[PDB]
Paper text:
The ER-localized Hsp70 chaperone BiP plays an important role in protein-folding homeostasis. Like Hsp70s in other compartments, BiP does so by the reversible binding and release of unfolded client proteins, a tightly regulated process that depends on the concentration of active BiP and on the nucleotide bound to it. MANF’s SAP domain engages BiP in the ADP-bound state and disfavors nucleotide exchange, thus acting as an NEI to modulate BiP’s activity. Our studies suggest that MANF contributes to protein-folding homeostasis in the ER by antagonizing nucleotide exchange on BiP, thus stabilizing certain BiP–client interactions.
To better understand the details of the interaction between MANF and BiP, we co-crystallized BiP’s NBD in complex with the isolated SAP domain or with MANF. Charge complementarity between surface residues appears to play an important role in stabilizing the NBD–MANF complex. MANFE153 hydrogen bonds with BiPN200 and BiPT203, and MANFK138 bonds with BiPN239, contacts observed in both the NBD–SAP and the NBD–MANF structures. MANFR133 undergoes different interactions in the two structures, forming interchain bonds with BiPE217 and BiPD238 in the NBD–SAP crystal, and intrachain bonds with MANFD119 and MANFE136 in the BiP–MANF complex. MANFR23 is observed to engage BiPD355 and BiPD357 in a potentially stabilizing network of hydrogen bonds. Contacts between the SAPLIP domain and the NBD (observed crystallographically) do not measurably contribute to the affinity of the binary interaction with BiP in solution, suggesting that they may be dispensable. Therefore, whilst contacts between SAPLIP, SAP, and the NBD trap the otherwise flexible SAPLIP-SAP interdomain linker in a particular conformation, in solution the SAPLIP domain may disengage from SAP and the NBD, as suggested by the NMR studies. MANF contacts the opposite surface of the NBD; the cleft between subdomains Ia and IIa.
Numbering used by the authors: 27 to 406
């Protein structure tokens, strides 16, 4: 096994960690980032790009930048989920052997068709190489996380992706369970009920876990597969674009370059508003050599997204019903994903459970990788 690594193979972002000196170390990639976009792309030239480099050229290559391969991985063509998601994806997806395949251009007008597994394998290879650089030796084995709702086919496909990347995926472990392990909830005594609330960039997952004698079980799952941090950005985008036209008289929509410059500052401001109450957004030479200068308040950000924020509670109530539990039967609450940093999200969860405090202490972007790395630590 050697040094086995824990890998959160996320829909939008992936994360890699290892256990050493009786603690978890989340490994930074060669650009110094602890998370790595699950992105693959090809340039006008032959060059293949994985991670940050792939996501940064998304704007200039909108139709041949692959992402969200995890939505397709291990599914059939006829699957209702696949047919829904291909309408939201810019790149072309096609049937081959009654399964979804991703068709992209390499360079010089040459096309190529990859299986979801191959895309995920490329991302895994990048996480593998990231880990190898930190450890200073080859990595052969890994613990990979998947959503709780994944079936056998999806679990096996994730293993296959590993195999292609040269990784022996020792264990497949459910994302909420990994998050629970990160917070040391497996050290708790007796029988307890655990609510995991996972709000990523483009996905929302609620899971009710039990723990019994330091061993978990996923009782019920729910959420929204197309609700995440990006939807909160889009409401902010829509607000400020409308404001710009109202003040200047200029419609910015058809200028792709300027719109990306705004999305960059909106994303920065959103993160800032998790700890501050206002954030200036200044862009010099924004559109037709005219500047942009507005402020986003926490109150406004909340106002623009209030309906979306409240909609997260319905899945929480539904999983409790399917688990045959009341609010008061929940002993632990675990918040995972960057969007859970938002104060309003935390308050809504807190208030739903009549003032009970969620667990804190772990980077919610990293919690799942953390847990996987602990399991890897055991198997090293």
């Amino acid at each position: 096994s050697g040094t086995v690594v824990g890998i959160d193979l996320g829909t939008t972002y992936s994360c890699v960690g290892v256990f050493k000196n009786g603690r978890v170390e989340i490994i930074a990639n060669d650009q110094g980032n602890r998370i790595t976009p699950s992105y693959v792309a090809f340039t006008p030239e032959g060059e293949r790009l994985i991670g940050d480099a792939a996501k940064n050229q998304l704007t200039s290559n909108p139709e041949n930048t692959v992402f969200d391969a995890k939505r397709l991985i291990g599914r059939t063509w006829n699957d209702p989920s696949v047919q829904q998601d291909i309408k939201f994806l810019p790149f072309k997806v096609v049937e081959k052997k009654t399964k979804p395949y991703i068709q992209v251009d390499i360079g010089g007008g040459q096309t190529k068709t990859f299986a979801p597994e191959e895309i995920s394998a490329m991302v895994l290879t990048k996480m593998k190489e990231t880990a190898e650089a930190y450890l200073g030796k080859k990595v052969t084995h890994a613990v990979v996380t998947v959503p709780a709702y994944f079936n056998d086919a999806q679990r096996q496909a994730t293993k296959d992706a590993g195999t292609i990347a040269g990784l022996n995926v020792m264990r497949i472990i459910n994302e909420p369970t990994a998050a629970a392990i990160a917070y040391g909830l497996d050290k708790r005594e007796g029988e307890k009920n655990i609510l995991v609330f996972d709000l990523g960039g483009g996905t929302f997952d609620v899971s009710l876990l039990t723990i019994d004698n330091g061993v978990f079980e996923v009782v019920a799952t729910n959420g929204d597969t197309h609700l995440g941090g990006e939807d909160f950005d889009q409401r902010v985008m829509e607000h400020f674009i409308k404001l710009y036209k109202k003040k200047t008289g200029k419609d910015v929509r058809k200028d792709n370059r300027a719109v990306q410059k705004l999305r960059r500052e909106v994303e920065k401001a959103k993160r800032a508003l998790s700890s501050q109450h206002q954030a200036r957004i200044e862009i010099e030479s924004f559109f037709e050599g005219e500047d942009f200068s507005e402020t986003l308040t926490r109150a406004k950000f909340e106002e623009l997204n209030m309906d979306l924020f409240r909609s997260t509670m319905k899945p929480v109530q539904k999983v409790l019903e399917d688990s045959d539990l009341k609010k008061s039967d929940i002993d632990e609450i675990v918040l995972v994903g960057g969007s859970t940093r938002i104060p309003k999200i935390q308050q809504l969860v807190k208030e739903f459970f009549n003032g009970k405090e969620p667990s804190r202490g772990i980077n919610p972007d990293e919690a799942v990788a953390y847990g996987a790395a602990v399991q890897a630590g055991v198997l090293s």
